[PDB]
Amino acid sequence: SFSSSSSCTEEENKHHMGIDVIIKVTKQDQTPTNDKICQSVTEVTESEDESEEVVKGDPTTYYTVVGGGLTMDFGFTKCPKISSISEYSDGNTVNARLSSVSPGQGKDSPAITREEALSMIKDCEMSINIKCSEEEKDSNIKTHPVLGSNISHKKVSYEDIIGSTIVDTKCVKNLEISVRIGDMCKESSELEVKDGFKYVDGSASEDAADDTSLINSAKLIACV
Amino acid sequence: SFSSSSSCTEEENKHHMGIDVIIKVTKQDQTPTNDKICQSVTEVTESEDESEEVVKGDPTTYYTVVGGGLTMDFGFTKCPKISSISEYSDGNTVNARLSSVSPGQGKDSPAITREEALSMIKDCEMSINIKCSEEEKDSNIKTHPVLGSNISHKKVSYEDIIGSTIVDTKCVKNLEISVRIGDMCKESSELEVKDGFKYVDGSASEDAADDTSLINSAKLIACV
C-alpha cells in the first residue's frame, strides 16, 4: 500500500516525476498505404552491455518504433523512464505516445525529491529521427488498455526539452510533437514543464499551445 | 594572394578558427595484434541527403575512422571543418589526429568574426565512440605529409567541448584525448580553448595538462 508501483507516496517533498511524449506525423501524398502500426519496438540503453562503458555524458536510452510506414527513433537522456509506447493509424497520419506510467498500474514509478526534479526538468533531452519504413510485417500489439502517465498536455511553463529533430521528407510531410514533464500524481506547478513544435510541409514553428487533443488518445494501441 | 586557402587574412576582427583533436588509445593486453591504421575514413553530414531534413538542432558531421583494430566514431556539431585525418600505430597504441587545416595549404580555411568565434567556441561539441574492429584490410594511406592546423595543445582556457564519450572495454584499456579550438594563424584573445580527459583502465580524470606531446605528431600518417 506503499510500493511506488501501487501507490502515490505521501512522503513530503517527493514527486512521482514522469515524461509524456506525443507524436503526430502526416505522411506525404504519394506515400504507399501502410496502417500497420506497432510493428516493432526496440529499446537500447548505452552502457547496458557488459563491455560498453559510458565514460563522459549520461546514458541514453534509444527507442526504435517501426509502424505505419515509418521508423521513429527516439533518444532519451536524463529523462524519467518510458514504460508505455503506443500508436494508431488514422488516414494518412501515424500517431504515437511514449510515456512513463503513473503509480497504481503495476509499473514502477519512482518518486524523487523536489531538488532532483528541478535538475531533471532542466537536463532531460529527447532526440527524434523519423525515417521511411517499407516494413509489411503485421502489427504486434497488446489488447490491454494503454497505461498512462496521468500528465495533461495543457499549456504550462516552457522548457527546451526536444533536441535534435530529423525527418525524411520522402514520407514525412508534417510533424507535430508535444513533450511534457511533470508530477504524475498531482500537478505541482514549479515542476510542470512543456516543449513542442509544429513542422508543416517544411516550415517549423514553436508557438506554445494546448496539446490535450493534438492526437486522440482514445485510439492509441499499446505496442509490445 | 588573397584566398583563405592561400593566406591568412589581415582583415581586422577576422579569425581563421580551427579545431584540433588528438586521440591516444591503449588497447587491452590480449587484444589481437592489429597495426593496420587508416583502413577507412567515412564522413557523413546530417541533411546532406536531398530527402533528409534537420528540423531542430544543428547538422552533425560524423567521421568513422577504422584502423588498428578499432573503429573511432566522431560526431562534430557547430565546429570548424575537419580537413585532415591521420593515424599511426605504436606498440599496443593507436593514435589519431583530426583537425582543420591552417591557411596556405590548399584547403579552405574560412575566417570568421570574433563574435562568431566566441559563439562557436561555446557551441562546438564533439562526441566519441570507440568500438572494437575486426577489420583486417590493408591500410589506405596517403603519401603526402599530414596537413596541420597550426594549433598547439598547450594549456589554455578550459571549455566543455567533449560530449558523449563511449568505449568498448574489450579493446579499449586507456583513452586519452585533447581537443583545442583556436586561431590557426596567431593565438588570439579569448579565442583559445581546450578540453580533454584521461581514462586509465576504468578511471577517468579531467585535470588540465600540456598535451603538446600526448602523441608524436611526427609519426602521423595521412588517412585517405
CB of A139 within 8 A of CB of A36? Answer: yes
Q: What would the grid cell of residue A16 be? A: 512521482
CB contact under 8 A, A55 and B127: no
Q: With beta carbons under 8 A apart, name residues in chain A contacting B199.
A: 55
Evaluated on CA atoms B55, B61, B66, B70, the torsion sign reads negative
B203 touches chain A (CB under 8 A): no
What technique was this entry resolved by? X-ray
> How far apart, in whole angstroms, are the C-alpha atoms of residue A73 and residue A173?
17
Q: Write down the residue that cell numbers 583533436 correspond to.
A: B21
Burial of B100 (0-12, 13-18, 19+ CB in 10 A): buried
* Residues found in chain A: 224
Q: Identity (one letter) of the amino acid at A67?
A: G
Q: What would the grid cell of residue B213 be? A: 606531446
Chain B interface, mutation test: which of A26, A30, A56, most B Cβ atoms within 10 Å?
A56
> How far apart, in whole angstroms, are the C-alpha atoms of residue B99 and residue B1?
24
What is the CB neighbour count within 10 angstroms for residue A25?
A: 23
Q: Identity (one letter) of the amino acid at B101?
A: V
How close A50 gets to chain B, by Cα (Å)? Answer: 9
For chain A, how far is it from start to end, CA to CA, in angstroms? 28
Q: Which residues have a Cβ under 8 Å from the Cβ of B213 and sit 6 or more positions away?
A: none
Three-class DSSP category at A192: coil
Q: With beta carbons under 8 A apart, name residues in chain A contacting B204.
A: 55-56
Domain range summary for chain A, segments of one domain joined by + = 1-224
Chain A interface, mutation test: which of B53, B70, B162, B195, most A Cβ atoms within 10 Å?
B53
Which residue from B63, B58, B220, B36 is spatially nearest to B133, judged by alpha carbons? B36
Which residue from A55, A57, A56, A75 is spatially nearest to A65, judged by alpha carbons? A75
DSSP line for B57-124: S-PEEEEEEEETTEEEEEEEES-PPP-EEEEEEETTEEEEEEE---SSSSS----EEHHHHHHHHHH-
Beta bridge partners of B132: B70
> How far apart, in whole angstroms, are the C-alpha atoms of residue A77 and residue A125?
5
Q: What would the grid cell of residue A140 be? A: 504486434
Q: With beta carbons under 8 A apart, name residues in chain A contacting B179.
A: none
A44 touches chain B (CB under 8 A): no
Strands A203-205 and A157-158: unpaired
Beta bridge partners of B133: none
Which residue from A12, A177, A14, A15 is spatially nearest to A100, judged by alpha carbons? A15
Which residue from B186, B43, B48 is spatially nearest to B111, judged by alpha carbons? B186
What residue of B is the nearest CA neighbor of A171? B51
Structure's resolution in angstroms: 1.9
B56 touches chain A (CB under 8 A): yes
Backbone φ and ψ of B5, nearest 5°: -65, -20
> How far apart, in whole angstroms, are the C-alpha atoms of residue B195 and residue B180?
7
Which residue from A110, A94, A80, A91 is spatially nearest to A38, judged by alpha carbons? A94
> How far apart, in whole angstroms, are the C-alpha atoms of residue B3 and residue B57?
31
A200 touches chain B (CB under 8 A): no
Q: With beta carbons under 8 A apart, name residues in chain B contacting A170.
A: 51
User: Where is A61: in which H helix or E strand?
Assistant: strand A60-67
Q: What would the grid cell of residue A179 be? A: 513533450
Burial of A141 (0-12, 13-18, 19+ CB in 10 A): middle
How close A130 gets to chain B, by Cα (Å)? Answer: 10
Burial of B190 (0-12, 13-18, 19+ CB in 10 A): exposed
B164 touches chain A (CB under 8 A): yes
- Burial A180-198, CB ≥16 within 10 A → b, else e: bbbbbbeeeeebbbbbbbb
CB contact under 8 A, B55 and A199: yes
A57 touches chain B (CB under 8 A): yes
> How far apart, in whole angstroms, are the C-alpha atoms of residue B105 and residue B103?
6
> How far apart, in whole angstroms, are the C-alpha atoms of residue B68 and residue A16?
48
On whether the B1-224 domain is CATH 3.40.50.11890, my answer is: no
> How far apart, in whole angstroms, are the C-alpha atoms of residue B91 and residue B94?
8
